Structure 1
Amino acid sequence: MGPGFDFAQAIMKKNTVIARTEKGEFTMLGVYDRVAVIPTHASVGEIIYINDVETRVLDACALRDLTDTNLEITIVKLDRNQKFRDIRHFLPRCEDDYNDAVLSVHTSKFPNMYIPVGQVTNYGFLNLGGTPTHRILMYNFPTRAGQCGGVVTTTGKVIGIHVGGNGAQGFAAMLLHSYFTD
């Protein structure tokens, strides 16, 4: 509808796949080469389905901060025959607050879904499903089941992936450039 939705669509159309684990279907953001991200509660194993194709997992790492606190981001390297467009230059370098974000989801239940969530707060600490979690972004939208893994963007930036909600607010795990250096 406007330039926020334009940037979101450009990310969705080239840098997402549908990931299926034994815990459900998730929006999955591809970042570069065969490297993608998914919420850690997806419980990635040795095999995952990517757009309904059986795919070997070459590596999976559940990220934690240097205090050994959950970040709710798992970085997955896929045994896929195709690379993702490299979008690492759209990742923020530091923790920040944002204006005017979009949450974008693509699954069997919610294809081509875009939500203007408005202002994004650097919330920090969240007890997420009973797990102490750091680097949480918060937005005042009543997000629902089916949205985990959804991509949070501003114009110019890919800032997080949706990991939860409390019925009135939604919560995303930050993406930082430093997670994807090699």
Structure 2
Amino acid sequence: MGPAFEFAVAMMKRNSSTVKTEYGEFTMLGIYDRWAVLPRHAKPGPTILMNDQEVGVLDAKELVDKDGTNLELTLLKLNRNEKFRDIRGFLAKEEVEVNEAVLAINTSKFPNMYIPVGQVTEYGFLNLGGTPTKRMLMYNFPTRAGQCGGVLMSTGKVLGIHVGGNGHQGFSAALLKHYFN
């Protein structure tokens, strides 16, 4: 939990930004090069507001699996010269389970706030907002609107991105190494 939070904070400082799409305000983790990730329901258009500045979106990939099932992630390539710090070494090849994770959020509504979510379990299939969705990671903590995009982390690992929630159960889309390339 403690080394989780230390990792979480250093990672948010180096690789996250606050983004606005027409569909709301999100935390955004940049991954490597000009590629970042948002929840799919962030629905990025041709331009987004990153740290209050218009940034053109050169490409958005809505991620689905081999059967077209929603993974609730949108990869985006940014029209910007600054490259993100390569963090793909922190993404696992498959869905991570951990005893101690922190969820990290960084928006106008939740400015640099961290939640100790505890154990993260590979939940897998979840019908989320009426959309059958896979590779879900689940954690218990009281979820809230505005926390999507939050970055789920433990010591040495970026597990995924917060995309949904009901009640006191939160859900991240696993953020997997091979999504990058």
* Structure 2 SS opposite 1:143: coil
Post-superposition, which runs of at least 4 consecutive aligned residues in structure 1 deviate over 4 A?
A: none
> Any idea what the Cα deviations from partners look like across 1:2-27, whole Å, max 9, x if unmatched?
21111001110010011100111100
Give the equivalent residue in structure 1 for 2:6.
Answer: 6
Q: Show CA shifts across 1:119-140 (max 9, x none).
A: 0110111010000000000001
The one-letter code matched in structure 1 to 2:8 is A
Cross-structure match for 1:47? 47
- Deviation of 1:83 after TM superposition, in Å, equals 0.9
Partner in structure 2 of residue 106 of structure 1: 106
Find the aligned partners of 2:130 and 2:78 in 1 and give their Cα distance.
29
Partner of 1:90: 90
> In 2, distance between residues paired with 1:140 and 1:37?
23
Q: Write the letter of the residue equivalent to 1:53.
A: Q
1:82 aligned counterpart, secondary structure:
coil
Contact 2:48–2:55, Cα closer than 8 Å, also in 1: yes
Report the Cα distance in structure 2 between the residues aligned to 1:157 and 1:175, rounded to whole angstroms: 10
* Count of residue pairs the alignment pairs up: 181
| Contact 2:96–2:174 (CA under 8 A) maintained in structure 1 | no
Q: Distance in 2 between matches of 1:97 and 1:14?
A: 24
Between the aligned partners of 1:169 and 1:46, the Cα distance in structure 2 is 33
Aligned to 1:9, the other structure's residue is in SS state: helix
In structure 2, the residue corresponding to 1:146 is in which secondary structure? coil
SS of structure 2 residue aligned to 1:119: strand
Deviation, 1:80, is: 1.3
SS at 1:142 equivalent: coil
Partners of 1:34 and 1:51 in 2: CA distance: 15
Task: Provide the rounded CA distance (Å) in 2 between the counterparts of 1:175 and 1:155.
Answer: 15
**What TM-score, normalized to structure 2?**
0.98
> Aligned partners of 2:10 and 2:112: how far apart in 1?
12
TM-score, L = length of structure 1: 0.97
Structure 2 gap segments, 5+ residues each: none
CA distance in structure 1 between the aligned counterparts of 2:106 and 2:91, rounded to whole angstroms: 20
Cα separation, 1, equivalents of 2:67 and 2:97: 22
Please give the alpha-carbon distance, in whole angstroms, between the structure 2 residues aligned to 1:95 and 1:120: 10
Question: Cα deviation per residue 1:36-56 (whole Å; 9 max; x = unaligned)?
Answer: 000000111111111111111
Identity of aligned residues (%): 67
Does the 8 Å CA contact 2:95/2:137 hold for their aligned counterparts? no
Listed one character per residue, the Cα deviations across residues 47-90 of structure 1 (whole Å, up to 9, x for unaligned) are 11111111110100000000110000000000012111101001
Q: Which amino acid aligns with 1:3?
A: P
Q: Which residue of 1 aligns with 2:160?
A: 160
Tell me which residue corresponds to 1:173: 173
Counterpart residue number, 2:146: 146
